[PDB]
């Protein structure tokens, strides 16, 4: 019932933990970067995933447990402008996270309106992962969430995606929003 059936293909990257960032590589002006950001006002965990759009590698990841709203946004800003003012991919739906406009943070809106949008984004991430295109810091917390994200049947008979056990899907969504922008041999539509 694992969602990420191609987890055996997930490349693992060595990294240096500096501050709260898991840093694999510093900024490269020759490259374009983007940030998949699962965050919000009332959230136990917020995750920022910096994707290198030329190499397809998560070159930096930032996870924070119970940070204030001013902390998440200030650190999202510093993270974006440390990678060529990378544009953020956030589930803004069009009112709240426009705090990004105030801070002057470039961003692409990704409204997770229906369960199928969430399921599409993640299934895209799972497909790239099974194709050998996803590479993340070699952190066990990342690996555990991917393994723990599973399909569950409903009484109707159809399946839904859920994180039980610890019940965290903030890394999963952070990676999905980032790899949605990734052109390998295909760009993500829908």
From TrEMBL:
Keywords: ATP-binding, Endonuclease, Hydrolase, Magnesium, Metal-binding, Nuclease, Nucleotide-binding, Viral genome packaging, Viral release from host cell. Mg(2+) 1 binds at residues 38, 170. Residues 35-180 form the Terminase large subunit gp17-like C-terminal domain. GO terms for molecular function: ATP binding; ATP hydrolysis activity; endonuclease activity; metal ion binding. Mg(2+) 2 binds at residues 38, 91. The record marks 44 as: Modulates nuclease activity. GO terms for biological process: chromosome organization; viral DNA genome packaging. It comes from the Viruses. Interacts with the terminase small subunit; the active complex is probably heterooligomeric. Interacts with the portal protein. Belongs to the Tequatrovirus large terminase family. The terminase large subunit acts as an ATP driven molecular motor necessary for viral DNA translocation into empty capsids and as an endonuclease that cuts the viral genome to initiate and to end a packaging reaction. The terminase lies at a unique vertex of the procapsid and is composed of two subunits, a small terminase subunit involved in viral DNA recognition (packaging sequence), and a large terminase subunit possessing endonucleolytic and ATPase activities. Both terminase subunits heterooligomerize and are docked on the portal protein to form the packaging machine. This is Terminase, large subunit. The chain holds residues 257 to 449 of 485 of the full protein.
